[PDB]
Amino acid sequence: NQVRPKLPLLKILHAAGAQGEMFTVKEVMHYLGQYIMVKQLYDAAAQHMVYCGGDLLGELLGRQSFSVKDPSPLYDMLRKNLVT
Amino acid sequence: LTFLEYWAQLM
């Protein structure tokens, strides 16, 4: 199946390599993990901790830090920003 | 460690 990012979440995907308008959940996550690596938001020391606070992704998450080993705040955000 | 495989448990 396929879903549509919102204008706040789509800007974040088109700044990683994505091109178009509509994607799959699974490739949303690919281009979403690309973002954290290109703009350098992850912790170099403990590479499970992302520091999205300063930038758009954080304002979208309602957080300023989150771990990749507990990513449920991604699935609070992945339901609120994708039209099924 | 490595964000690469940490970000592959979710996906």
From Swiss-Prot, chain A:
Expressed in all tissues tested with high levels in thymus. Induction: Down-regulated by cisplatin (at protein level). Phosphorylated. Ubiquitinated and degraded by MDM2. Deubiquitination by USP2 on the other hand stabilizes the MDM4 protein. It comes from the Eukaryota. It is found in: Nucleus. Disulfide bonds: none annotated. Residues 1-84 form the SWIB/MDM2 domain. Along with MDM2, contributes to TP53 regulation. Inhibits p53/TP53- and TP73/p73-mediated cell cycle arrest and apoptosis by binding its transcriptional activation domain. Inhibits degradation of MDM2. Can reverse MDM2-targeted degradation of TP53 while maintaining suppression of TP53 transactivation and apoptotic functions. Region I is sufficient for binding TP53 and inhibiting its G1 arrest and apoptosis functions. It also binds TP73. Region II contains most of a central acidic region and a putative C4-type zinc finger. The RING finger domain which coordinates two molecules of zinc mediates the heterooligomerization with MDM2. Belongs to the MDM2/MDM4 family. It is linked to Bone marrow failure syndrome 6: A form of bone marrow failure syndrome, a heterogeneous group of life-threatening disorders characterized by hematopoietic defects in association with a range of variable extra-hematopoietic manifestations. BMFS6 is an autosomal dominant form characterized by intermittent neutropenia, lymphopenia, or anemia associated with hypocellular bone marrow, and increased susceptibility to cancer. Interacts with MDM2. Interacts with TP53, TP73 and USP2. Found in a trimeric complex with USP2, MDM2 and MDM4. Interacts (phosphorylated) with YWHAG; negatively regulates MDM4 activity toward TP53. This is Protein Mdm4. It comes from Homo sapiens (Human). The gene is MDM4. The chain holds residues 25 to 108 of 490 of the full protein.
